[PDB]
From a paper:
These structural differences suggest that the loops are somewhat flexible, and act as a switch to control the binding of NADPH and release of NADP+. Similar conformational changes of β2 loop and α10-helix can be seen by comparing the structure of AtPrR1_NAP_ + PIN with that of AtPrR1_NAP and the structure of AtPrR2_NAP_ + PIN with that of AtPrR2_apo.
Pinoresinol/lariciresinol reductase (PLR), an NADPH-dependent reductase, converts pinoresinol to lariciresinol and subsequently to secoisolariciresinol. The crystal structures were captured in the apo, substrate-bound and/or product-bound forms. We found that, for all 16 structures we solved, each enzyme adopts a similar head-to-tail dimer conformation, strongly suggesting that each PLR/PrR functions as a homodimer, consistent with the literature that TpPLR1 exists as a dimeric entity in solution. β4 loop covers the top of the pocket, and residue 98 from the loop governs catalytic specificity.
Numbering used by the authors:
A (entry chain A): 9 to 91, 98 to 129, 143 to 263, 272 to 317
B (entry chain B): 9 to 93, 99 to 129, 140 to 264, 273 to 317
The structure:
Amino acid sequence: KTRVLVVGGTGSLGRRIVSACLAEGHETYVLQRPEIGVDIEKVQLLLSFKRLGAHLVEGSFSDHQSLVSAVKQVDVVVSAMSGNIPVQLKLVAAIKEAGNVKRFLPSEFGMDPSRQKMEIRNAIKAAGISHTYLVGACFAAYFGGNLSQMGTLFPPKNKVDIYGDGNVKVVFVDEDDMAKYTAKTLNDPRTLNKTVYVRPTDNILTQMELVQIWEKLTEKELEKTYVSGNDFLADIAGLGHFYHIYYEGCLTDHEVGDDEEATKLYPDVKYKRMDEYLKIFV
Amino acid sequence: KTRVLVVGGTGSLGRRIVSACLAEGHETYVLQRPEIGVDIEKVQLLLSFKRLGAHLVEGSFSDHQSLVSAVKQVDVVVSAMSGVHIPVQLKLVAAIKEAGNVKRFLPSEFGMDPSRTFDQKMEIRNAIKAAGISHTYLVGACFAAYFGGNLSQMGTLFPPKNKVDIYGDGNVKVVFVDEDDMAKYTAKTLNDPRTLNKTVYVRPTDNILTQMELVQIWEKLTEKELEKTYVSGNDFLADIEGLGHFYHIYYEGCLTDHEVGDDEEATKLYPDVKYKRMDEYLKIFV
């Protein structure tokens, strides 16, 4: 059994990673930070982990030696901050000091920063820490269910902004599926010290294709305001990354080999399609 | 169907009240505040309520007329601030008074009767009375998540590992209630004619427990005796330099020092609620 410490386990992605690690059969440790000890929902979430067999390990980002003691107990560290640069770098320093970690999987929110955005990867390299990066897809909770409307995570009402012509291919993935891929890949010899691209073919969609999925489920056409590229840029760092995705098509402008793509490496994961994802909000 | 607006529906108690309101068949409205829109947990929670039949009503505590418009749509307003983020509740009262249509207001007091400084604690109740707003108060019990699961220790919701502070002798009766049960009592009482303009006491008999009895339940569940430090009333007060409510509950016995009638006690009024006992509550921590 691979021993895995999940950092950020009360986050949106982190709590799905804990569940996926338990389901995959890893011996799963969850960092229990002091600050969330007074949050009743986060305490009951951690207790739902325990009842499924996870071990809670106490430590905090402000206590370097507590981070060292947590990572000294496992083979793999998985980090998911959706729920930050200094914090990942504090983890990197603790991992380097501990010396025992076989693989570190920092979450990058599915966003490849090598295309300074590179500070965490540069510290991983300089520390000699083995790793796997999972990149290449927008999380459906943040870009899909809102029809990619900025400034809101709620489903659309009658109107939407269409970015450019909405004909640029984006890659969407359910966070539940990103968590399964993380749990599958973290002891896969094929992905040690590799970038793994998450590109589920059925979820390669232009913004207009995503909109049309919504319109078909609600049986009604949305009012549309088209936002040109320079009208977008004249209204200004995620805003910059959003532009790279929806106007320059950075998630789809290069090919990926089967030996480095998540759905090919892990074809047992039946990833949720965006029509099934959006069905819940209609 | 009684129409109910729940204010604080992404909070701890408040999300349980929304659930119990839907369970009861109330036409359930939930205030959707702009400030939770950055929080995916909160957004998906509210969308879960909408999926179950709730109505989301956009409004903000800093926008008086948005609150008036919200309360003008319902018969009953329930508010619960535990886990959200006296002024907020007073803003709600102002909007209810101006709206004029609300048949009953149920402000959560976190189980703590403020009528036992005194005038600051009574500020909301005084504004309710001055506005002529009809109400139901629910009081008399410690929420188990905050006083039971942690064996009444400070600074954590987890039970201790091998050491407990015992207050006084731990022989003062306290009343404990599961937050889930508080929410069901709230949903059942809010259109009960019997509780209009009443204080309803929540006193589940099996959950009237001294702190030592509560510790003993945990020691039996774990099969280990805890190391005990006894804290006198004088030392507790000296270290205060919420703790005041704590002192009155665990040292003065203010939850159990008076009798309540059946016609004003939640488990008599609503005997269909099978309230959770503390042995069952604590087992999830083992």
